[model samples]
Target: ARDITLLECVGKGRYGEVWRGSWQGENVAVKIFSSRDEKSWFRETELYNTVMLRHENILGFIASDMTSRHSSTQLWLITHYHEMGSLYDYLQLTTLDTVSCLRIVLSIASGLAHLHIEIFGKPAIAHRDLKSKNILVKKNGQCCIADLGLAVMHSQSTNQLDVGNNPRVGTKRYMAPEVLDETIQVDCFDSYKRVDIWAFGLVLWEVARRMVSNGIVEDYKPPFYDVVPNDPSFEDMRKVVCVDQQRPNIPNRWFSDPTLTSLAKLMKECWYQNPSARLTALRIKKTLTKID
Candidate 1:
């Protein structure tokens, strides 16, 4: 910990501050959690320490440590830094080509699928807070899934679920209909995975809108931006997603490009109102691999 130096404040949120830090003469990201979020820090560290947690598309966790500050605890999670930042910020400034768009979403699907599957007969994990902001873009035009503080793990071998005691829930704007309403199957592991699929669909929409399709590109807009308010309440999201059954509108230009057309169809399947009807992460990856 003494070897790491916080260089700049990159982000701030309910948990605490994220700093662009220097570690061993290399840039690294340090998420310093407030005293109130010690549990969240511990939970994320535990998940990272688990065997088989390392993957190309998931944020690389380096180390976790505790520091004393003003008679309180400051928990730090150090990870490899991606200068490109979150997908949400990336899409706002950059437009994608067909290939770049496909690569981004496909990489995200690969990471999500990895988290959703069991390894060595362990329980599968679910990223309960998956969203564009929780996904970071890599320098290679791919993405890495981040922010697993609210993640849940389940095991069929032992018939147990470890939903850590983090008061944090998912971002309301990205909440699936089942989650917005009260009908989600809390006991079912697949239920959480479906919720992630729903958020993934919304992110796909975000990326697709920025991709140049037939020499046309739509502006970056959050899902349901035309219907719900910014930072929408649970009821606001529930009304639009569950009561109205509304989804992000697909642009006509998307159909003009074969690649975007296939991607449009894929994203629609992920947004299905019935969670089970949504495409699995593996299925989505397979479909993407065939799309040019």
Candidate 2:
């Protein structure tokens, strides 16, 4: 049995702490679940097992195991290490060249499209939670989707089908208007797809700031996360994203930037109140293609 060496804590979150670990002198990242999230331990492990090494933008899983020392039955999911860290962190620093910015976003979309469409005779996959933290940036200036525990196979009937409830999955800022209002059918698969599209738009906005600004957006911060925590119930989300006409701030300096001026307008269109108004990931991909 190969032993894993713990180096340092890289990231901490609701489910677990991510550690920079090593195996036989090879670099890897190990996510060891907290006691309360032992359930996630198995879910993430199972997800990687089902969908591993499929998409280029999706992280590669090296191995997984149950802990021997923890009577608590903790689980560890290990994968190849990308030291650049999450896209969230990368966006904080400025100085991105045009090609690098486009490549990173395009890689993410390609990976996403793979999951959203058919793969290896299997149904497409939906990333239930798409956020900056879940996007890992590599040293080569590429990005990949991470944390598949909440994902679903496109062909599989979601849990909502049985329960007739969707209870608004996904982070507050990125959720589509349909998710914020129960008036829309919660059991429909369309709602889930739209939610991801909404989030993708916001993420594109984040990346665009860096692309044109030559770095992170000025005064850039997590999308209204500080304003409302506790995941923001459906009603709360509607008020902010829909009625309030609120959106992520793009600094005035960005408006002066040609690349950003275009992005700012596009980002506004994405945050529109109507669910029908948001652009699809494919559409965003096409726009990026033109820039190449």
Candidate 3:
């Protein structure tokens, strides 16, 4: 097993912590998953391995290593170095220009579509956990999807596709309404794709708000963010998003700019009640392209 030099804790999550690392003078982000999630480790590593360097918005994977030394087995995923780090880190620090924000999110949409469409007879793959933390900004102002630990390949056996067979898994905050209610049922694969698009809408809101405002907006947690890790029950997201028809409170100042106003309006569509009503990834990319 090759042991590479690790760098800073640039990104982190429940399953793993990512280090800004280096191998042979090249930059890399190394993810060392938490000790317990062997399944997730194998899932992410396997997908990236099967798919080689290709998509622009999909981060390039360099290598994967499993070690059973030091009293425990460990999985480490090494990806091409991205200095800009995760989108979450960026949102917490910088305000965005409308065009800048649009550029970043559109790149992500483009990349995600690649994963969701037929490229190599490979069925779509959904990043079950799509959040700011899983998005990385490139120095060139583009974005890439990272953290595929929760991803599910669409081209699975019929047994795997059936919801009855697959176990429930995903991040609670970003999960779609149907997923939360378990009312509308499909094979587990479509559910994963819908949930990712739902989260993408929220992330679009996060980015739009940052773009319109001169500085940061109030940090509002996703639905149930306040009540989560405690109740762990179904969240009434409708109060803030649907019933009241409230949004992230696009500052009045933003309305002054037509581009910003358009962006804000489209984000509202993402939070719509019916899942089908939600904007498609392709549409989101198209909208962003129109932004100033």
Candidate 4:
């Protein structure tokens, strides 16, 4: 591995910092992990090594490296850089047309389908932390799924579920009802996939709100923004999702447009309280393809 010149910091959090770097005259996103979050770095690297995870909607992985600087260890995961940034940031300023809205969400569904369906040699994957912030917008008007640190894998051929040893949980706001209530069957692989579908429905709501209908659009707001406080605790989420049984509200404006109307129905399916009743990623992708 050669040296990459860090140009600018694109994001920062407990995971450490994501920098836009120059590698061999090309731009790349370099995630430099904090010492506290080394497990995430190792887990992501391990998953990448085990799977041939190449897809247009999945983030492009380049390399993982551990370097010593000033007698301290730094872990780096390098990936393709997208200038448009995360879907969360993009939605804050941009409104979408019917076509662009479908393109964005459909690309995400295609990616999730690719992750959940097992092939002859590939394992099925579930993105435990599927959120707008964990998705990146590419220049082509498509989005790519990123941040695989909390991902879980299943191999049907071996009947094995590889949850890894990472103890971190997903974002509370996106946690499924089953997850919030601690009733999820952790042994069942489908349980994890359903959890992702719940989060996907919330993300779909976020995107759909920004799509203009009759020259009308709602401002960007995270799921349950009206119900929960900022950075809500697990207990707060459990109360809203499990005890109160609340889901994000669908605005009346959505019913006026054909595309938004269809999307509203699809997202509702994903939000079914029964995990088994929720739509599969493949099914969601198929439905999105048919929507005009």
- lDDT (Cα, tens digit) per residue for candidate 1, span 111-229: 99999988863458899888898899998888999988888998777888888788777889999998888899887888999999999999999999998966789989999999998
Over 1-292, each residue of candidate 4 has an lDDT whose tens digit, in order, gives 5778999999999889999999989999999999988888888987788555789999999999987868799899999999999999999999999999999999999999999999775699998999999999999999999988988999988898998888889999999999999999988899999999999999999999999999899999999999988889999999999999999999998988999999999999999999999999999999999998
| Per-residue lDDT of model 2, residues 159-198, tens digit only | 3322212232566666776666645554565555566767
The per-model lDDT (C-alpha) reads: 0.89, 0.70, 0.69, 0.93
Q: lDDT tens digits, residues 1-292, model 3?
A: 3457886787566677888876888777888888767777777776776553268899888788888967988788888887877787788768777668778878888877776654444556777778877788999899999867667665543334412222436665666666666664565566566677878877876776667454535453443454335435345553433344444455577677787778668767776657767776677777777766
Worst 10 residues of 2 by lDDT: 159-168
Instruction: Provide the clash count, candidate 4.
Output: 0
Say which candidate scores most in lDDT: 4
TM-score of 3: 0.81
Of the two candidates 3 and 4, the one with more favorable lDDT, higher being better, is 4
Candidate 3 global CA lDDT score: 0.69
- Provide the TM-score for each candidate, comma-separated: 0.96, 0.81, 0.81, 0.97
Error of 3 at 174 (Å): 1.8
